[PDB]
């Protein structure tokens, strides 16, 4: 039921850098995850133009931010196109390899960690604030999958037995003990207003 | 052979704004066209992972910048995924409508024309420097098409009888008389270094 995969050398090295480098501007993880969600929403919106049945799994195109102080998690939910099992493995493999190489070269040349998104590896900035990331995803052409990594050079993929989401992606950030500010309403509002004010989909910040 | 289409009200209004508003920072058109080319290159690179035959129409993934002082044109060529006839009409229609609305609202609120790309309508910044834009495109699933507009509320689409390009998109900017600086080698190099230094594909500036 649970499949374990080794990250390739470059991605494993990038994840180690993100976890271990001293960098105070951690708030940029939110902008990267929202940007990825917006891109997935653009994809399903575009496909629905030639094929309206693509929206049978859900018409609403939105992003939800769900803080949970009890579980110490910040969840980013979108109703985008979602990812197939192959998409998950390819995005944690071949895509993340070319992106990492180009980004790590720039960091050595004097670039900032905040430019990560320009290299297509923005998702991995989640490890600035999270000790573990769980991704639940559902694409129209596949079953619901759960991807997870606490870094450490590996990730797991399993079919998800949880509540069906219709279509889209849910990124569950298991926050580091010293990073609970990202569970606070005013702090999340501040980051969204600063970095994601022009996203073309409604962003709802859930209250506890 | 030649089909004529009316732009919808919002896009026609955006194109008029771009042509008539006083805005000195025109150089941003290049960044938007290179960004679109990079996105199309990401698309074909991703599709080729599950299907390597997608690269039968060309393996090289690059961007070429071709100035022509005689014809007063700056051409941006890419070997990206290209666009089908439907893609051309949809990108000049439904996609450009939602993007325009969101962008024009921001401009009224105090935003800058330089943020156009965040709204998915970055291509239309070409009209800051061009009096006419011709687009030649070839997608694996369709024939070679020529799209053209001098704004004025309409665009044409025809099957292209020119030289086959294999796969990708060619954007031909017919420059305004006072915008010939964008044909100069040092000026193009300056803009690419400033705004497109981290693009993940080789950018070749052709010499005359
Ligand atoms: C195992 C590594 C993957 C990490 N995750 C979850 C992400 O990057 C990520 C992906 C999507 C997504 N759904 N469908 C789709 O095409 N994308 C996508 C979007 C932008 C770049 C690439 C993408 F695949 C999302 O909505 C939200 C995300 O945070
Ligand atoms: C009639 C209006 C269209 C204007 N043009 C030519 C562009 O926007 C434009 C489009 C592509 C392209 N090829 N394939 C594909 O998917 N794209 C694409 C990329 C980014 C956003 C949307 C896209 F369709 C390109 O390589 C270069 C471009 O300058």
Author numbering:
A (entry chain A), B (entry chain A): 16 to 223
Authors' text:
Here we report the investigation of the role of protein flexibility in the modulation of binding kinetics and equilibrium thermodynamics of drug binding to heat shock protein 90 (HSP90). HSP90 is one of the most abundant proteins in the cytoplasm of eukaryotic cells, comprising 2–5% of cytosolic protein under non-stressed conditions. It is a ubiquitous molecular chaperone intimately involved in a variety of pathways, including cell signaling, proliferation and survival, and protein folding. The N-terminal domain of HSP90 (N-HSP90) contains the nucleotide-binding site, which has been the target site for drugs interfering with ATP binding and ATPase activity. The unbound N-HSP90 has a highly flexible lid segment comprising residues 107–14137.
For 7 of the 20 compounds, it was possible to obtain crystal structures of the complexes bound to N-HSP90 with loop-in and helical (8, 14, 16, 18, and 20) conformations of the α3-helix region (loop- and helix-binders, respectively). The main difference between the structures is the conformation of residues 104–111, which can adopt either helical or loop-in conformations. In complexes with compounds whose R1 substituent exceeds one atom (compounds 8, 14, 16, 18, and 20), these residues have the helical conformation with an adjacent hydrophobic pocket lined by the side chains of M98, L107, F138, Y139, V150, and W162. Steric clashes between the ligands and residues 105–107 would prohibit these complexes from existing in a loop-in conformation. All ligands occupy the ADP-binding site and form typical interactions, which include hydrogen bonds of the 2-hydroxyl group of the resorcinol ring with the side chain of D93 and with a water molecule that generally mediates interactions with G97. In contrast, for the helix-binding compounds, there is a large favorable entropic contribution to binding, and most of them have a binding enthalpy penalty. This switch in thermodynamic profile is thus directly related to the conformation of the α-helix3 region with compensating differences in enthalpy and entropy of about 60 kJ mol−1 between loop-in and helix-binders. Protein flexibility is another possible contributor to favorable binding entropy. As previously mentioned, the N-HSP90 crystal structures show higher B-factors for residues 103–111 in the helical conformation, suggesting greater structural flexibility of this region compared to the loop-in conformation. In the helical structures, however, the Q23-N106 interaction is not possible due to the binding site rearrangement, and this may contribute to enhanced flexibility of the helical conformation of the α-helix3 region. on can vary significantly, indicating transition state destabilization playing a role in prolongation of residence time. Helix-binders reach up to 230-fold slower association rates, when compared to loop-binders, indicating a higher transition state energy barrier for helix-binders, as depicted in the right-hand panel of Fig. 6.
